[PDB]
Design a protein around this ligand. Sequence first.
Ligand code: GFF
Ligand code: CL
Ligand code: MG
Ligand code: NA
Ligand code: NA
Ligand code: NA
Length: 326
Amino acid sequence: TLNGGITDMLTELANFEKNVSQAIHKYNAYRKAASVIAKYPHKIKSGAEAKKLPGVGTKIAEKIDEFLATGKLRKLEKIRQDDTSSSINFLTRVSGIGPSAARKFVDEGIKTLEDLRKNEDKLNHHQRIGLKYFGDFEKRIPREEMLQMQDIVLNEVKKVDSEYIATVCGSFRRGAESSGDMDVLLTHPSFTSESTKQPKLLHQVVEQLQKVHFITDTLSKGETKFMGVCQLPSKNDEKEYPHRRIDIRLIPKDQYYCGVLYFTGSDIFNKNMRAHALEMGFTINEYTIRPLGVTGVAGEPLPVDSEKDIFDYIQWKYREPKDRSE
DNA sequence: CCGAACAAGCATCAGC
DNA sequence: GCTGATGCTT
DNA sequence: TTCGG
Ligand SMILES: Nc1nc2c(ncn2[C@H]2C[C@H](O)[C@@H](COP(=O)(O)OP(=O)(O)C(F)(F)P(=O)(O)O)O2)c(=O)[nH]1
Ligand SMILES: [Cl-]
Ligand SMILES: [Mg+2]
Ligand code: NA
Ligand code: NA
Ligand code: NA
C-alpha cells in the first residue's frame, strides 16, 4: 500500500464526517478520494499531484500537503482529543448504533463499552446483539474459514431444496484473502419478478441454518433480506471460532445478474457504476437496469443475461469481480 | 456559481 | 392496523 | 467535499 498513510487519514476524516458531523456528502467525498488514491500506482509526492485524480479537490489536496510534510493532520489530532467526538465515533462501531443513536447515548452519559453493557435495556435488538459480539465483529475472516462457511451454507441450502442456488458474493467473490463478513445471494425458481409461487423461501433457509447451529442470532429479517450472526463449529477441545456477521439476500431468479452485480460490490464500485449509469441515461438497482426517459422517470427493464450485459449498456468494459475492490 | 451526489430492505416511530 | 419519514444497514 | 455544466 504505497499511500497507506494518506488513505488512512482520508478514511478517518470520512468516519468523522459521517459519525460526528452527520455530513454524508463530505463522508462520500473522503471515501471516494481514499478509494481513487488507493488505486493510484505511484507514491504520491504532493497534493497537487493527487489533485490530478478525480475526486481529489482543493481541500483534500491541502490536507495531503500537510500530511506529507509532517506525517500528521492537525484537524485529526484535535478531533482525537475531543471526547464527545471520540465517544460518538466509538459507539458507532457497534452494529445498530449510528450517528444519531451514538449522539443520543453520549447525551445520557453512555460513552464507553462498560456504559453500554450497564444499559442493555436501552438498546434495541440489533444493538444488543452488536454489543454482544462487539469484539468478534471487528475480526477479519480468513478466506480459509470463508470456504468452510461456504461449504456449510451451500450444502444446508441444498438439503432444504435442490433448486436453491446460493452464491457467496462480497469481497469473497472478488477474490479477497480475507473478508469482513459473509454475503450470500440466494435464488429459487419459485420466486421471480413475475410471481411468488411459494412463501417462506428465505425463512426455510434461515431455519435450517439455525437448526444446525450455524446461524446463532438474528439482527433483522424479512421476506427477502436476512441480517444475522453465524459461527463455524469447532473441533474437540479447540478454542471456538469468533462469531461472524452473515447477510443473505433472496433475489428474483430472473434478476440474478443485477443481483450478483449489486452484492459483489464493492460499495464504492456500485456507487461509481450507478453514477456512470445515470450519466449514460440509465438507472441500476439490484433488480434491473432501466433507461431514463426524456422526463427523468425510469422506463421498462432492459434485457440482461449476464453481468457483462449491464457493463455494455453503460459503455464500460467488463471488469472481473477481482477488479471491483474500489 | 450551484445543484447533484446510488439504491433499497428492515426496524422503528409518529400520525391517523 | 396502514402510510410515510427516518435510522441503520447492505 | 467534489464535479460538471
Ligand atoms: N449500491 C450499494 N451497494 C452496496 C452498498 N453497501 C454495500 N453494498 C453491496 C456491495 C457490497 O459488496 C455488498 C456486501 O456488503 P459488505 O458491507 O459486506 O461489503 P463487502 O463484502 O464488499 C466488504 F466490505 F469488502 P467485507 O468487509 O464485508 O468483506 O453489498 C451501498 O451503499 N450501495
Ligand atoms: Cl455534507
Ligand atoms: Mg461482506
Ligand atoms: Na481532481
Ligand atoms: Na454502527
Ligand atoms: Na455483509
